[PDB]
Scaffold this motif. Structure first.
Motif, PDB file in Angstrom:
ATOM      1  N   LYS A 483     -83.540 -47.105 -52.975  1.00  0.00           N
ATOM      2  CA  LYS A 483     -83.319 -45.758 -52.710  1.00  0.00           C
ATOM      3  C   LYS A 483     -83.588 -45.825 -51.332  1.00  0.00           C
ATOM      4  O   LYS A 483     -83.182 -44.480 -51.014  1.00  0.00           O
ATOM      5  CB  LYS A 483     -84.133 -45.071 -53.319  1.00  0.00           C
ATOM      6  N   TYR A 484     -83.720 -46.820 -50.665  1.00  0.00           N
ATOM      7  CA  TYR A 484     -84.153 -46.604 -49.260  1.00  0.00           C
ATOM      8  C   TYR A 484     -82.977 -47.010 -48.383  1.00  0.00           C
ATOM      9  O   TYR A 484     -82.943 -46.295 -46.992  1.00  0.00           O
ATOM     10  CB  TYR A 484     -85.297 -47.302 -48.623  1.00  0.00           C
ATOM     11  N   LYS A 697     -98.580 -49.012 -47.067  1.00  0.00           N
ATOM     12  CA  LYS A 697     -98.416 -49.423 -48.765  1.00  0.00           C
ATOM     13  C   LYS A 697     -98.334 -51.138 -48.191  1.00  0.00           C
ATOM     14  O   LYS A 697     -98.021 -51.686 -48.792  1.00  0.00           O
ATOM     15  CB  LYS A 697     -97.257 -48.822 -48.872  1.00  0.00           C
TER      16      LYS A 697
HETATM   17 CL   LIG Z   1     -92.988 -44.489 -54.595  1.00  0.00          CL
END
Ligand SMILES: [Cl-]
Length: 827
Positions: A483-484, A697
């Motif tokens: 998704k990135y 993260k």
């Molecule tokens: Cl996420």
């Protein structure tokens, strides 16, 4: 406690085994009945109702009462049911009020009172019920009091007719029963043998009648009621004038619409008028028996234009949406809704060319057989708006008409995040669904097959359902979407691995091919059946969307069984029934392959790679972490290869070189369904580029990492780099259940857990890293092996599984992502 909760939600897709179609022209709400007794109401996107009759019997007819939130259903057991839309708490719901079964005299025949036609009177006070005997019974609603006084017997009609028009069959079946469009006192009755009669209700006299030279199939009444159009079993339809001056006429104009050769019957027909004076003639069937007879067709005739809309499945009902109310002068249609046995088709009758209308719901998820499904939670907006943009160009041929079934007001609020459901199919297609909150609509379709190489009757295939299997080798087995970055990795049945990229414009480029011989260091075997595909050698042009740039064909061309795609390192790991290999899709070079075939395997084997997992942990040195690849097989073998990827500034200048670091064997020798590494805080290592878009993260590298192995029988936790055991959880030795699928789930502060789908159909949650059973549910039954095999989880405690080849059922284990679809129907 305050963060785990399992409850049923809603279903997505096309209903399984439909049998009835209904539609309220006033409420603009579509109704579908199934062979399992379920009735589903569909209005505006977000407005949906579902009901169940207490008896398991097919719904045969659905009649939504004129201008009211009520409907009458007919089941194959000759039962009638009154349903309503009661607004309970600011949102309407569906409920069954009363019921009634037509009986007849005790010593009478059972089929003599089998209902054929149901006529809701315009007053919403009476139901006129045609039966196979020829009698029309009158039922008053509600209370369902069968008024024996108002019954129109068969011979009671024949006594008003001349002697030469009294030749009655024993079962003079009522095949037509309609109300006069401008006179609620007159009703039409139509019998099979050919008798059609207009009846004076308050007076009991026949005002009009004619005998048909051919058997009667159906009939339609014009807006003013001054013309009848009857269709017959010989494939013909004729027009009849209705006038009080000539109560006994002969036909005005008869024809068989298709050729001079014999034809199948015309089961139904419509005669709609337009303000331009050009009537629509819409009839189902009438196809010639000579060749086009086994085809399900609906023909439309308007302004010298004919089109026989042909469907790939049975037509179990159709309707035509008209701009008119019962009091309007002209019909003026604009939409043709056809409920096929496998799909729903809507045709724009106003736009020249009659183009298909795109469905906002009820999309047949099984237009090709679903082979795999992959869910990606929380999509960035740059990729989200990019997929919906590339998916709009492919839907250009569709109509510009807004969705006409807009009845209702959806009270469900906007979705919190943008979720995305991907489905791989047997014909090689991948579809991108908008599983954000509840509504599941199609965004983009990808066709991977592009990599591999009369005039009358006016037939025209419509719908997207293909009931044939041209080539099962195209079947998609594994799907991974980043998704990135926009890199897509799909894997096929014939051992093909495609790595695609999302760009906004078209391109004419060649797809580079690299053979991955998994059996390079072992000889003495030969493949038998299911040979590989055939890629196009020349440069193939591609539409905007996901364009492939590299193709990796596994030899032998076995089914791909595991897939992993690291977007930052630009590596893709694939695995089949015999071995696995790591590929450098940036340099299009094969890093390595490893044949895992045991010296004595089966005629599923032991060296059957089942899970692939990229990780950046400590393997050899206790203080130096390096990229790595983990592979688990059926024999409990867990391989670990130390990867050496160059920096981004030299990714195209140095080859990626791997080296085996560990060979771990679980002593219970159960298949490996999950490998996972934790950081210093026991938090699972983030996905590729997840840290790149949120540097907070960054996994804890200070503090010993842990290795989590999930087998079919038990859970084991190790300590990297020394991979020494420290925890265990023998689930099969206790509850007697085996792990089918495992996935890391983040519930909501927010900590991580382990979502486990057992073979029993239960779904348990397990803490990290202590492995404490936090909760246990019961989603699927044990005998539902078909649905439990195609069940997918999400990051944030949501799931999808198949209740039928066509329907997904959604469920949520999180208390923060609950969705109760509320909607309102008014007036
Ligand atoms: Cl996420």
């Amino acid at each position: 406690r305050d963060l785990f909760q399992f409850n049923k939600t809603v279903e997505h897709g096309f209903p399984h085994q439909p049998s009835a179609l209904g539609y309220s022209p006033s409420l603009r709400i579509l109704a579908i009945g199934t062979r399992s007794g379920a009735i589903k109401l569909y209005g505006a996107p977000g407005v949906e109702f579902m009901g169940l009759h207490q008896e398991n019997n097919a719904v045969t007819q659905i009649h939504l009462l004129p201008g009211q939130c009520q409907l009458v259903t007919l089941l194959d057991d000759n039962s009638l049911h009154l349903w309503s839309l009661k607004v309970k708490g600011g949102a309407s719901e569906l409920q069954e009020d009363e019921s009634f079964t037509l009986r007849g005299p005790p010593g009478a025949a059972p089929s003599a009172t089998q209902i054929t036609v149901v006529l809701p009177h315009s007053s919403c006070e009476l139901l006129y019920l045609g039966t196979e005997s020829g009698n029309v019974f009158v039922v008053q609603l509600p209370a369902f009091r069968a008024l024996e006084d108002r019954t129109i017997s068969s011979d009671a009609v024949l006594q008003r007719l001349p002697e030469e028009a009294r030749h009655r069959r024993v079962f003079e079946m009522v095949e037509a029963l309609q109300e006069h469009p401008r006179d609620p006192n007159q009703i039409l009755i139509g019998y099979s043998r050919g008798l059609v009669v207009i009846w004076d209700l308050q007076g009991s006299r026949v005002l009009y009648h004619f005998l048909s030279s051919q058997q009667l199939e159906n009939i339609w009444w014009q807006r003013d009621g001054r013309l009848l159009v009857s269709c017959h079993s010989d494939g013909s339809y004729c027009q009849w004038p209705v006038s009080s001056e000539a109560q006994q006429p002969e036909p005005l104009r008869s024809l068989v619409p298709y050729g001079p050769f014999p034809c199948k019957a015309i089961t139904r027909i419509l005669w709609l008028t337009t303000r331009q004076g050009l009537p629509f003639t819409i009839f189902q069937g009438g196809m010639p028996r000579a060749s086009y007879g086994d085809r399900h067709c609906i023909s439309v005739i308007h302004d010298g234009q004919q089109t026989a809309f042909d469907f790939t499945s049975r037509v179990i009902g159709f309707t035509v949406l008209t701009e008119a109310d019962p009091a309007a002068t002209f019909d003026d249609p604009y939409a043709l809704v056809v409920l096929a046995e496998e799909e729903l088709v809507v045709i724009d009758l106003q736009t020249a060319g009659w183009p298909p209308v795109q469905l906002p719901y009820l999309a047949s998820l099984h237009c090709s057989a679903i082979t795999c499904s992959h869910h990606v939670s929380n999509i960035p907006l740059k990729l989200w708006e990019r997929i919906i943009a590339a998916g709009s160009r492919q839907n250009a041929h569709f109509s510009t008409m807004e969705w006409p079934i807009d009845g209702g007001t959806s009270l469900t609020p906007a979705p919190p995040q943008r979720d995305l459901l991907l489905t791989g199919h047997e014909d090689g297609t991948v579809r991108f669904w908008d599983a954000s909150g509840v509504c599941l609509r199609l965004l983009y379709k990808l066709s991977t097959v592009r990599v591999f190489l009369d005039e009358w009757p006016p037939l025209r295939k419509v719908g997207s359902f293909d009931p044939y299997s041209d080539d099962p080798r195209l079947g998609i087995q594994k799907i991974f979407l980043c998704k990135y970055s926009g890199y897509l990795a799909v894997a096929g049945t014939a051992g093909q691995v495609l790595v695609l990229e999302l760009n906004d414009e078209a391109a004419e480029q060649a797809v580079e091919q690299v053979e991955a011989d998994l059996l390079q260091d072992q000889e003495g075997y030969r493949w038998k059946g299911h040979e590989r595909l055939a890629a196009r050698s020349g440069p193939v042009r591609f539409e905007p969307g996901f364009q492939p740039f590299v193709l990796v064909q596994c030899q032998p061309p076995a089914v791909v069984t595991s897939l992993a795609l690291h977007s930052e390192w630009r590596l893709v790991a694939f695995g089949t029934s015999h071995g696995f290999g790591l590929f450098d899709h940036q340099q299009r070079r094969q890093v390595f392959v490893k044949c895992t075939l045991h010296p004595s395997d089966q005629l599923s084997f032991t060296g059957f790679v089942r899970t692939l997992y990229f990780a950046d942990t400590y393997l050899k040195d206790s203080s130096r972490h390096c990229p790595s690849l983990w592979a688990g097989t059926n024999g409990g073998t867990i391989y670990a290869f130390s990867l050496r990827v160059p920096p981004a500034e030299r990714r195209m200048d140095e080859p990626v070189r791997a080296e085996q670091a560990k060979e771990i064997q679980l002593m219970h020798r159960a298949p490996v369904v999950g490998i996972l590494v934790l950081d210093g805080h026991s938090v699972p290592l983030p996905e590729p580029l997840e840290v790149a878009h949120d540097l907070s993260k960054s996994p804890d590298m200070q503090g010993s990492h842990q290795l989590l192995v999930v087998s079919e029988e038990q859970f084991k936790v190790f300590t990297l780099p020394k991979v020494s055991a420290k925890l265990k959880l023998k689930l099969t030795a206790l509850e007697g259940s085996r792990v089918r699928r495992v996935s890391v789930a983040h519930f909501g502060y927010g900590e991580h857990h382990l979502a486990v789908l057992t073979n029993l159909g239960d779904i348990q949650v397990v803490s990290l890293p202590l492995l404490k059973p936090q909760v246990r549910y019961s989603c699927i039954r044990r005998e539902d092996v078909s649905g439990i095999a195609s069940c997918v989880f999400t990051k944030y405690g949501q799931g999808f599984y198949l209740i039928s080849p066509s329907e997904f059922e959604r469920f949520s284990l999180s208390t923060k992502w609950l969705v109760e679809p509320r909607c309102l129907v008014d007036s």
